[PDB]
């Protein structure tokens, strides 16, 4: 069963969890080609492993900047969780290392760009399209939650499309292995669940609220709570007032009403039956889950990639050179990295 697979998968995760991999490369093994993306904490560069000739995405965290934004424990969770995990819709971490100035996470390059890029251009996805993606995120959270992991930053900007047109969840910067509750205010304003903003202390259920936001945005072209500045967004979320486009199927409206339930005792994903209330929902009736997991479903959108190392599905960013100090900067703080 699914229950048997998750058990095997937990053991694999624990062995890597207790004994994490470390210093398995350095900078000069890599050709820096182009910046693929940027964030609040780090930048990602397309890179080339010079001995194998493979292309990878390398995330660069500037140690000092990590310390000034109070993300040390978060950055240590990111590397440890990511090197331990193994699912078909999670990016693979191949190498990690550090030097005097920075922390590096070389990852599987995903040539299709972000879901964000395509969703904004096209405007919105058809329901069947959104469903293809939703299902994959549903299975990915089932896996992550069974390992006591919360993800905490689901957004189109962290969902890469691979060559097969499938999802690779990237960015485990707020990932955290927790049994019981957690209180850190983090995520992305539009995707924040009401518990986070209200400082209640929260659990896995915030990922399922985030899935309901994602589905709404994929299917509508816009998030269910937007405004010009974050405080107005937080206002609408807590208000627990959503309006649906008239072109949403009744089934979709119904899925979403349970996922965007402000009352986290009645929110799908957090009930007795757990993730099955979502999987056996009317909206997912056509979805063959095992097929989705095996990647033997026909993707409705395969991005165009003219050869390897093509970056035409990513925006252009301003480049910055990688400066490494002669002196080690925050050595004690990142010793386990």
């Amino acid at each position: 069963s699914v229950k048997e697979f998750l058990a095997k998968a937990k053991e694999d995760f624990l062995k890597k969890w207790e004994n994490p991999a470390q210093n398995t490369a350095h900078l000069d093994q890599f050709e820096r080609i182009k910046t693929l993306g940027t964030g609040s904490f780090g930048r990602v560069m397309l890179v080339k492993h010079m001995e194998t000739g493979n292309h990878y995405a390398m995330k660069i965290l500037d140690k000092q900047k990590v310390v000034k934004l109070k993300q040390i424990e978060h950055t240590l969770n990111e590397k440890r969780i990511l090197q331990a995990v193994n699912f078909p819709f999670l990016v693979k971490l191949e190498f990690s290392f550090k030097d005097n100035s920075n922390l590096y996470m070389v990852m599987e390059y995903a040539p299709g760009g972000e879901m964000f890029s395509h969703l904004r251009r096209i405007g919105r996805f058809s329901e069947p399209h959104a469903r293809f993606y939703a299902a994959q995120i549903v299975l990915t959270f089932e896996y992550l939650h069974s390992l006591d992991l919360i993800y905490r930053d689901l957004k189109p900007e962290n969902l890469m499309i691979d060559q097969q047109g499938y999802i690779q969840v990237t960015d485990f910067g707020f990932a955290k292995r927790v049994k019981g509750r957690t209180w850190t205010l983090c995520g992305t304003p539009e995707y924040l669940a009401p518990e986070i903003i209200l400082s209640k202390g929260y659990n896995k259920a915030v990922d399922w609220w985030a899935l309901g936001v994602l589905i709404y945005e994929m299917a509508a072209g816009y998030p269910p709570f937007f405004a010009d500045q974050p405080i107005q967004i937080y206002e609408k979320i807590v208000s627990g007032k959503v309006r649906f486009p008239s072109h949403f199927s009744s089934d979709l409206k119904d899925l979403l009403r349970n996922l965007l339930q402000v009352d986290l005792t009645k929110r799908f994903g957090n009930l007795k039956n757990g993730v099955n209330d979502i999987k056996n929902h009317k909206w997912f009736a056509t979805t063959d889950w095992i097929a989705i997991y095996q990647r033997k479903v026909e993707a409705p959108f395969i991005p165009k990639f003219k050869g390897p190392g093509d970056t035409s599905n990513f925006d252009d960013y301003e480049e910055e050179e990688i400066r490494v100090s002669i002196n080690e900067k925050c050595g004690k703080e990142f010793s386990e990295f």
């Binding site: 900007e157 910067g173 983090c186 816009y222 937007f226």
Partner: peptide, 20 residues
């Protein structure tokens, strides 16, 4: 329309994460 309000808003570009 809602889509039009969204498109005239300040948050149609990529959204970075918050923190403490």
């Amino acid at each position: 329309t809602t889509y039009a309000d969204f498109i005239a808003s300040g948050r149609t570009g990529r959204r970075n994460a918050i923190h403490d």
